[PDB]
Amino acid sequence: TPQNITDLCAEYHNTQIHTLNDKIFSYTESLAGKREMAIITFKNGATFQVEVPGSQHIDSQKKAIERMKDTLRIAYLTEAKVEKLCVWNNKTPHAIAAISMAN
Amino acid sequence: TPQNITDLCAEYHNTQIHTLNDKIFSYTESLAGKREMAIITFKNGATFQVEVPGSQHIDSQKKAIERMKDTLRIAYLTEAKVEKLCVWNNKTPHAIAAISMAN
């Protein structure tokens, strides 16, 4: 059972860590059909998505996808520094699997 | 697989982008029957709705409609700048499909 985001990220294929150490620059969310997703950017130009729930996700990820969008919204609004994102790099924008926040 | 609200908005019929770059001026919410909806305005006089869930919405949009009203409420209370709205222009008030928040 992993002790940090880097070790967690390494348990999966097609992932990587992006280190941001910065607040979120913009937060976007959509209710449009088949694009029920969130998109965040950072001032360095990096863009990430929380994917639309799909057949790629198992049932236990459903609640966590919803939570992640909650987390990104409040992080954005509080200007919380994002340390790292673990992302799947076989999607464009890279798809968020995990987030760490630290000052 | 869009990277921003403008490219997302462009995937749908009967939509357009409004650029606000302003905080929400007023936030209204109703629990009355058949009008379970939210309405927001900006100081420029613009009015937008989150529509009552209906037959025009597929299942996956229902959860995202609830999220959007949560987003608008907290955006309003924190005086967060709304960058852009993607809206359907075949409804009055124009109906929100997506929001971006920046600055």
Place this chain on the structure above:
Amino acid sequence: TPQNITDLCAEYHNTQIHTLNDKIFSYTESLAGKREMAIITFKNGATFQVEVPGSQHIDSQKKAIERMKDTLRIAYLTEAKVEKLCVWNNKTPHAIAAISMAN
């Protein structure tokens, strides 16, 4: 499709607008059986309730009732100014149908 709370309120019988332009003075919440409700007051004494869900409510109102109590609690804690309430005046306390926040 309503442009504002006054127009929305006018679509229903037994309603009226109260214009408060003030923050909520007190917030009360109960989980007692058959009294699962919220009550708010303003400094002048005017009292309003979010009614216990009952057979007068259609299914779509259930989520909106829960949303309204969430809204009143955060409005209270943030000292947000309530502009207007649309209420049913065939109940005591008058029962909230919609709320507008501005200023």
Place this chain on the structure above:
Amino acid sequence: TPQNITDLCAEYHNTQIHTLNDKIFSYTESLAGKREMAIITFKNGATFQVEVPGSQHIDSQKKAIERMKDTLRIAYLTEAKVEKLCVWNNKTPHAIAAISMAN
């Protein structure tokens, strides 16, 4: 239909009102099995619980129990003053039925 927490409390057997007019001193919450509950204390030592959902509860109370634990947490974190609690007397700690918050 009660105007305030004192009148609501008086509708029930084994209840009493505690007048605190003070912020929550401590907030405790548990996910351990059969102890899925919250406990709060005030600086005077008075201690209160939100009971684990049980056969004493009716269905309409389930969502309100969850809401009450939400309210207690955010009240604690914002240092909001608690005016009164209506509690059941026949449990230790006394079990919260209702809360009022006021300036």
Place this chain on the structure above:
Amino acid sequence: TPQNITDLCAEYHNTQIHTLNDKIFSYTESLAGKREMAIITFKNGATFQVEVPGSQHIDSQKKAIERMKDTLRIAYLTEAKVEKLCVWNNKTPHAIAAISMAN
């Protein structure tokens, strides 16, 4: 019922109290399949998890697990002082059973 986290903790096998009296240093959460979990750390090096929901959990614990991750995120973002954690010490990182917050 228990009046405090220490008494609550002692009701269970394989638990202990950690006394932190410090804000959370880092907050991590994951939506990756089979690792839908949260991890927190403190400046003293201590690391804790909210376990992925599984067969060891009774159904009533499920909502409480989701609540705990909510609480840890907001505690982190508000820099709220964590007093104590009750944990299962038969897991690595130690698994959170309960939390107490006090200033």
